[PDB]
């Protein structure tokens, strides 16, 4: 039974919450922090200066260097460090060798670009109470630094949007020695969960208040079982009483509707209102808490006699490290997320297969079990791409081995899968069994690659294998070593279709405090674990990612790695899932806001365990879960060890038939999924998109988190996630025409509204927005790889403008040849009775030399076009005219007139145009 720190039980949380209580209750609180104005210089997109913190009654100060950077992107950055610790002028307790510097390598792990300073940024005004810097797009952005008390207002369009230290909560815990007097009860040793943190540095937390002025909704800081629009944390009806926490942890049977930490953390928050968006990224790898309150701008936020405009107050604090924050001024959600991704990276180009359906449990028990499931899925016409092996495949929980009794012929298993282009995923976790006759542990120890305790001994604790050590993936030599262990001729029983799942990388330690490592463990660089905890999981996923790039000579190819724990930047390395969820309706419902929050925080490749991990879902629940799951970018069924087998062919009729139809829908849309992942790769566009993102002008959209748009398609989904619901109310965001994907019934035209839609068990509620084109593949196949050369259908969805656009991206799904132009990317435009296809980027034909994959694609066609909302002037016309590659011909079209609420639509068959070429098709 699992104990979790509440705020009051975390020392530095208590002190920052108490600092906040004092400041908001004190009369004319002033933050005891001031810029020494004569220390301050501006040059070349950068202010630097010394803040002086007054630390006592006698007016004694310490020096904290400030750097405000103004980047070419129009993003700003604010860093505050501690001069005394930069210089090494402190003493650690216990003769600790822990680093004295404030942790400063989060940047190195996370930030991959966007750091160029804007030499167009300039001082506009400065007296010696303040200075205003103009920066960004034609100098539209301003930051007003106030010197005494320190504060910054970030403005655009003549208003303040974000304020730092307006409430005076800035708090940098300066180093002090442990002395008795001539409340410090949390400053030093702290005990929790059977462990005592020796706390060699003492207090060193960093915190700040960040106000979002005139914003009522904030979003982000996944992962939490919480709504997408984040809740208040200081009490009130339907609010939380604790701050949101980010401390990656193994949270068994995590509850719904809670600010408690889960497995991964991305400290990126956005605020949105009608036609305005801003955001911040709090670049800190330590335990981090965020309090949120909303109210009027007065000190009593319920006061009368003041303006009613709401400001959202947030209060961030982390255990150690630099105070280090980026500020994004938007002004759209797209802008903000795009800038974040430039900083932290876009989604990696995925293995195409990994967008298929993944089949998993704890555990498939033999190579005969695997092979029998593969054959059963084919028997029941349930397509899938990957079958997954959990920890029981190992030899007594040693990674890089197999249980030879149960997994006789792993290579044969692999090859049976290879006959349908299917794949195998095996689990590898970061704990390495402490035992005899095990080369992997010997090398870990002998090469000094393990995480260490507070005195430099090798750390030891308990997980699956019993007594274990943990790889320190912060250490580049540990990463380089790990690479070597995955070569096909080193890791026996694996081969070219074997990929990897990392879990327990929080890290999970069964006998540790809060099921993780002590805070005073030491990592490569001599950083304390407290400094880097939230990066740990990402270091390990990174190690594994780079290991799969090349596993034999000649090979260079896209990794696929699933992780449990993560940080800002993990999008570069693979997928995540939301951990050990539960087989209950509430968890199915919660999955959607969680997965949305992932993508709007720049890590869209995300999902939850279909069916729920713990327990046994009813058959209707499981069926609904498939209908939701087909819209997770990462779509996997998984089940705990005590749960019954529930491979989907075991459900029974009519559930089997409905689940198979969900699967077929996912597979038919794979062309559009893959394209959505392409855009996530190009600029960090989310793969599924909430209403606030797609419709920033529609205020009613802000709190909506149960429906979403898919990629670029205009498809709007609202899965049923309530027991015995047989209809669904979909919020229609705007005035465009929306059609039922299945019947083409007109759900709305002309007016934003809530529309009621029939939704029995066999129905997936899915609408097609007018103005869009999207591609699918109609021919059903057993896996994604067997679709690779099938023809495409294009769906052209027209509203009253009779105009549409969309796109389609393809490549080999596996190599890095996309980096040299080996891909097809089409833009489809419908206008003035004409559908055209052009290169999305406007490349000329051969300036690119065709490789082997592009040549094969010459046999692949668009064969079918469906126009929904077909105009009446096409009635009685029985051909269209097709032009492509110099040739012109006629193709048959059937016009079907409107009928009841069913739209007019038209179908062109046997179009016969190669997907890689320009074309023009004239209707009417
Ligand atoms: O590899 C097995 C299993 O491990 C993780 O889950 C476990 C599990 O829920 C339970 O036994 O409790 C521990 C401690 O909290 C968890 O770590 C993975 O999350 C899961 O997907 C996997 O099947």
3-state secondary structure 24-35: HHCCCCCCCEEE
| Resolution, angstroms, 1 dp | 2.3
Instruction: Yes or no: say if 775 and 794 are a contact pair by the CB < 8 Å rule.
Output: yes
Question: How far apart are the C-alpha atoms of 269 and 336, rounded to whole Å?
Answer: 10
Q: 570 CB contacts (<8 Å, ≥6 apart)?
A: 264, 266, 537, 538, 541, 563, 576, 603
Atom nearest to 640 CA in ligand 1? 23
Residues 796 and 807 in one domain: yes
Q: Please compute, for residue 294, the number of CA atoms within 13 A of its CA located in the half-sphere on the CB side.
A: 17
Residues 55 and 71 in one domain: yes
Give the CA distances from residue 357 to residues 636, 662, 663, in Å, rounded to whole numbers and listed in that order. 6, 11, 8
Q: 1 burial class (0-12, 13-18, 19+ CB within 10 angstroms)?
A: exposed
Residues 665 and 726 in one domain: no
Paired tokens of 642: 């005590």
Residues 187 and 294 in one domain: yes
Residues 108 and 131 in one domain: yes
Helix ranges (DSSP H) in 380-535 = 410-418, 439-446, 476-485, 529-532
Question: In this structure, are strands 386-389 and 358-359 parallel, antiparallel, or unpaired?
Answer: parallel
Question: How far apart are the C-alpha atoms of 853 and 816, rounded to whole Å?
Answer: 12
Atom nearest to 362 CA in ligand 1? 23
Question: How far apart are the C-alpha atoms of 416 and 99, rounded to whole Å?
Answer: 52
Distance 292 CA to ligand 1 centre (A): 32
**Which residue, 593, 598, 602, is CA-closest to 229?**
593
Question: How far apart are the C-alpha atoms of 396 and 403, rounded to whole Å?
Answer: 7
Q: What H or E segment, with its residue span, contains residue 561?
A: strand 561-563
Q: 755 burial class (0-12, 13-18, 19+ CB within 10 angstroms)?
A: middle
Q: Three-state SS for 757?
A: strand
Paired tokens of 688: 């599924």
Atom nearest to 263 CA in ligand 1? 19
E-assigned strand segments in 190-252: 190-192, 195-197, 206-212, 217-220, 244-246
Angle between helices 476-485 and 536-548 (to 10 degrees): 40
End-to-end CA distance of the chain: 70
Question: How far apart are the C-alpha atoms of 80 and 172, rounded to whole Å?
Answer: 9
Instruction: Yes or no: say if 481 and 443 are a contact pair by the CB < 8 Å rule.
Output: yes
Residues 656 and 734 in one domain: no
Q: Which residues of 545-568 are buried (b: 16+ CB within 10 A; e: fewer)?
A: bbbbeebeeeeeebbbbbbbbbbb
The best mutation among 399, 427, 503 to test binding of ligand 1, ranked by most ligand atoms within 8 Å of the C-beta, falls on 503
Q: Which residues of 580-609 are buried (b: 16+ CB within 10 A; e: fewer)?
A: bbbbbbbbbbbbbbbbbbbbbbbbbbbbbb
Paired tokens of 176: 């002090």
Instruction: Yes or no: say if 687 and 711 are a contact pair by the CB < 8 Å rule.
Output: yes
Torsion angle (degrees, nearest 10) of CA 539, 541, 543, 547: -170
Question: CA Rg, the chain, in Å?
Answer: 28
Question: How far apart are the C-alpha atoms of 289 and 4, rounded to whole Å?
Answer: 14
Paired tokens of 572: 């570069």
Question: How far apart are the C-alpha atoms of 635 and 576, rounded to whole Å?
Answer: 10
Give, in degrees to the nearest 5, the angle at Cα 554 between 409 and 575.
65
E-assigned strand segments in 400-529: 423-427, 431-433, 461-463, 466-470, 498-502, 522-523, 527-528
Binding pocket residue ranges, ligand 1, CB within 6 Å: 250, 252, 362, 390-391, 427, 503-504, 508, 564, 579-580, 638
Question: Sign of dihedral through CA atoms 556, 558, 563, 566?
Answer: positive
Distance 395 CA to ligand 1 centre (A): 18
Instruction: Yes or no: say if 711 and 694 are a contact pair by the CB < 8 Å rule.
Output: no
Torsion angle (degrees, nearest 10) of CA 210, 213, 214, 219: -30
Instruction: Yes or no: say if 106 and 90 are a contact pair by the CB < 8 Å rule.
Output: no
Question: How far apart are the C-alpha atoms of 360 and 832, rounded to whole Å?
Answer: 49
Q: Mapped to the 3 state alphabet, what secondary structure does 763-776 carry?
A: CCCEEEECCEEEEE
Q: 716 CB contacts (<8 Å, ≥6 apart)?
A: 707, 708, 709, 710, 730, 733, 738, 766, 767, 768, 769
**CA-closest residue to ligand 1 atom 14:** 252
Question: How far apart are the C-alpha atoms of 709 and 500, rounded to whole Å?
Answer: 30
Question: How far apart are the C-alpha atoms of 759 and 623, rounded to whole Å?
Answer: 13
**Which residue, 449, 459, 446, is CA-closest to 520?**
459
Domain containing residue 363: 332-684
Angle between helices 619-629 and 655-668 (to 10 degrees): 10
- DSSP code at position 791: P
**CA-closest residue to ligand 1 atom 23:** 362
Residues 785 and 760 in one domain: no
Question: How far apart are the C-alpha atoms of 274 and 217, rounded to whole Å?
Answer: 10
Residues 419 and 325 in one domain: no
Q: What H or E segment, with its residue span, contains residue 905?
A: strand 905-908
Residues 751 and 896 in one domain: no
3-state helix, strand, coil in the chain (%, to 5): 20, 30, 50
Is the preceding omega at residue 378 within 30 degrees of 0, hence cis?
A: no
**Which residue, 226, 228, 178, is CA-closest to 200?**
178
Question: Sign of dihedral through CA atoms 258, 263, 268, 274?
Answer: negative
Question: How far apart are the C-alpha atoms of 536 and 207, rounded to whole Å?
Answer: 22
Instruction: Yes or no: say if 250 and 263 are a contact pair by the CB < 8 Å rule.
Output: yes
Residues 212 and 271 in one domain: yes
Q: What is the largest CA-CA distance in the chain?
A: 99
Distance 514 CA to ligand 1 centre (A): 15
Q: Which residues of 327-349 are buried (b: 16+ CB within 10 A; e: fewer)?
A: bbbbbebbbbbbbbbbbbbbbbb
Question: How far apart are the C-alpha atoms of 922 and 904, rounded to whole Å?
Answer: 18
Distance 446 CA to ligand 1 centre (A): 30
Instruction: Yes or no: say if 471 and 432 are a contact pair by the CB < 8 Å rule.
Output: yes
Paired tokens of 449: 């690659």
Q: 411 burial class (0-12, 13-18, 19+ CB within 10 angstroms)?
A: middle
Paired tokens of 542: 């990174």
Give, in degrees to the nearest 5, the angle at Cα 757 between 755 and 759.
155
Give the CA distances from residue 710 to residues 285, 668, 913, in Å, rounded to whole numbers and listed in that order. 32, 14, 26
Q: 139 burial class (0-12, 13-18, 19+ CB within 10 angstroms)?
A: middle
732: number of Cβ within 10 Å: 21
Give the CA distances from residue 367 to residues 198, 403, 488, 660, in Å, rounded to whole numbers and listed in that order. 48, 10, 19, 25
Instruction: Yes or no: say if 809 and 782 are a contact pair by the CB < 8 Å rule.
Output: no
Atom nearest to 363 CA in ligand 1? 23
Question: How far apart are the C-alpha atoms of 113 and 342, rounded to whole Å?
Answer: 6
Q: 318 CB contacts (<8 Å, ≥6 apart)?
A: 205, 206, 207, 282, 284, 286, 287, 288, 289
Domain final residue pick, 275, 300, 331: 331
Provide the domain count of the chain.
Answer: 4
Helix ranges (DSSP H) in 321-467 = 333-344, 367-379, 410-418, 439-446
Paired tokens of 43: 């040059």
The best mutation among 394, 580, 612 to test binding of ligand 1, ranked by most ligand atoms within 8 Å of the C-beta, falls on 580
Domain final residue pick, 744, 770, 796: 770
Residues 756 and 780 in one domain: no
Instruction: Yes or no: say if 828 and 806 are a contact pair by the CB < 8 Å rule.
Output: yes
Instruction: Yes or no: say if 414 and 370 are a contact pair by the CB < 8 Å rule.
Output: no
Residue 853: what are its φ and ψ, rounded to 5°? -65, -50
Angle between helices 655-668 and 670-683 (to 10 degrees): 50
Q: Three-state SS for 519?
A: coil
Residues 747 and 855 in one domain: no
Distance 642 CA to ligand 1 centre (A): 12
Residue with tokens 């609408």: 767
Domain final residue pick, 286, 314, 331: 331
Give, in degrees to the nearest 5, the angle at Cα 323 between 320 and 326.
135
Atom nearest to 564 CA in ligand 1? 19
Distance 477 CA to ligand 1 centre (A): 28
Question: How far apart are the C-alpha atoms of 262 and 265, rounded to whole Å?
Answer: 8
Residue with tokens 């009490």: 235
Instruction: Yes or no: say if 209 and 216 are a contact pair by the CB < 8 Å rule.
Output: no
Atom nearest to 390 CA in ligand 1? 1
- DSSP code at position 915: T
Question: How far apart are the C-alpha atoms of 618 and 598, rounded to whole Å?
Answer: 28
């Amino acid at each position: 039974e699992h104990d979790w720190k509440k705020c009051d039980q975390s020392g530095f949380c208590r002190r920052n919450r108490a600092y906040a209580d004092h400041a908001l209750s004190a009369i004319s609180w002033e933050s005891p922090y001031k810029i020494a104005p004569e220390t301050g210089s501006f040059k070349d997109g950068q202010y630097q200066a010394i803040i002086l913190k007054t630390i006592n009654d006698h007016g004694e100060t310490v020096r904290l260097p400030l750097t405000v950077s103004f980047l070419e992107s129009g993003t700003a950055r604010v860093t505050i460090d501690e001069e005394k610790r930069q210089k090494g002028e402190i003493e650690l307790r216990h003769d600790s060798k822990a680093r004295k510097e404030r942790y400063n390598e989060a940047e190195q792990w996370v930030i991959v670009g966007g750091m160029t300073l804007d030499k167009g940024a300039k001082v506009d005004y400065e007296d010696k109470t303040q200075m205003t810097v103009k920066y960004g797009p034609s100098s539209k952005f301003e930051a007003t630094i106030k010197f005494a008390p320190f504060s910054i207002d970030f403005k655009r369009d003549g208003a303040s949007h974000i304020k730092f230290n307006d409430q005076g909560l800035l708090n940098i815990e300066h180093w002090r020695p442990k002395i008795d007097p001539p409340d410090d009860s949390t400053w030093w040793e702290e005990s929790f969960g059977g462990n005592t943190d020796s706390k060699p540095r003492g207090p060193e937390s960093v915190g700040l208040d960040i106000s979002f002025v005139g914003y009522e909704h904030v979003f982000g800081i996944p992962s939490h079982a919480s709504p997408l629009s984040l809740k208040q944390t200081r009490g009130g009806e339907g609010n939380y009483n604790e701050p949101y926490r980010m401390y990656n942890a193994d949270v068994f049977e995590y509850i719904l509707d809670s600010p408690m930490t889960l497995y991964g953390s991305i400290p990126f928050m956005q605020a949105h209102r009608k036609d305005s968006s801003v955001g911040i990224f709090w670049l800190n790898a330590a335990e981090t808490w965020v309090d949120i309150t909303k109210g009027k701008d007065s000190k009593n936020p319920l006061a009368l006699g003041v303006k009613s405009k709401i400001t959202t107050r947030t209060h961030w604090f982390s255990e150690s490290g630099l105070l280090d924050v980026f500020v994004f001024l938007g002004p759209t959600p797209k802008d903000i997320i795009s800038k974040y991704a430039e900083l932290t990276g876009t989604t990696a180009m995925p293995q195409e297969f990994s967008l298929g359906y993944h089949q998993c449990r704890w555990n498939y028990v033999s190579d005969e079990d695997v092979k029998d499931v593969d054959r059963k899925m084919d028997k029941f016409n349930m397509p899938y791409d990957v079958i997954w092996l959990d920890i029981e495949y190992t030899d007594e929980k040693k990674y890089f081995t197999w249980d030879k009794h149960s997994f006789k012929d792993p290579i044969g298993m692999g090859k049976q899968l290879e006959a349908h282009g299917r794949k195998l995923v095996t689990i590898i976790d970061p704990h390495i069994k402490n035992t005899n006759n095990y080369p992997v542990v010997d090398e870990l120890k002998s090469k000094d690659l393990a995480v260490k305790t507070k005195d430099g001994s090798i750390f030891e604790g308990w997980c699956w294998p019993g007594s274990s050590h943990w790889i320190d993936a912060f250490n580049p030599a540990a990463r380089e070593w790990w690479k070597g262990l995955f070569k096909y001729d080193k890791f026996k029983g694996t081969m070219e279709n074997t990929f990897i799942w990392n879990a327990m990388n929080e890290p999970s330690v069964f006998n540790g405090p809060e099921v993780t490592m002590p805070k005073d463990n030491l990592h490569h660089g001599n950083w304390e674990h407290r400094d880097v905890h939230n990066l740990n999981g990402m270091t390990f996923q990174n190690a594994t990612y780079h290991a799969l790039l090349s596993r034999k000579p000649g090979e260079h190819r896209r990794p696929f790695v699933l992780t449990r724990a993560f940080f800002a930047g993990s999008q570069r390395l693979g997928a995540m899932w939301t951990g050990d969820n539960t087989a209950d309706w509430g968890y199915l419902k919660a999955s959607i806001p969680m997965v949305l929050s992932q993508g709007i925080a720049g890590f869209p490749f995300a999902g939850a365990d279909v069916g729920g991990f713990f327990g046994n879902p009813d058959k209707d629940l499981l069926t609904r879960w498939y209908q939701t799951g087909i819209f997770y970018p990462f779509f996997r069924a998984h089940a705990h060890i005590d749960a019954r087998r529930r491979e989907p062919y075991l459900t029974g009729e009519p559930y089997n038939t409905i689940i198979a139809a969900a699967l077929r829908l996912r597979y038919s849309l794979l062309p559009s999924w893959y394209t959505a992942f392409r855009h996530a790769h190009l600029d960090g566009t989310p793969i599924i998109k909430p209403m606030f993102y797609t419709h920033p002008s529609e205020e009613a959209g802000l709190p909506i988190d149960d429906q979403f748009f898919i990629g670029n398609t205009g498809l709007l989904a609202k899965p049923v996630t309530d027991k015995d619901r047989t209809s669904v109310d979909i919020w229609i965001p705007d005035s465009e025409v929306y059609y039922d994907y299945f019947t083409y019934d007109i759900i709305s035209a002309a007016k934003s509204k809530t529309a009621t839609l029939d939704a029995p068990l066999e129905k997936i509620p899915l609408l097609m927005r007018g103005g869009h084109v999207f591609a699918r593949r109609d021919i059903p196949r057993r896996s994604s790889a067997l679709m690779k050369w099938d023809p495409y259908t294009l769906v052209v969805v027209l509203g009253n403008d009779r105009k549409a656009e969309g796109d389609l991206y393809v490549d080999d799904g596996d190599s890095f040849d996309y980096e040299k132009g080996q891909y097809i990317h089409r833009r489809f435009i419908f206008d003035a009775n004409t559908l055209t296809s052009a290169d999305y980027e406007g490349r000329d034909d051969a300036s690119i030399k065709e490789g082997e994959w592009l040549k094969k694609m010459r046999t692949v066609n668009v064969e079918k076009i469906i126009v929904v909302g077909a105009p009446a002037a096409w009635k009685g016309k029985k051909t269209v005219t097709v032009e492509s590659e110099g040739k012109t011909w006629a193709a048959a079209i059937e016009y079907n007139p409107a009928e009841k609420s069913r739209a007019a639509f038209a179908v062109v068959k046997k179009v016969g145009v190669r997907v890689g070429a320009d074309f023009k098709i004239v209707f009417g």
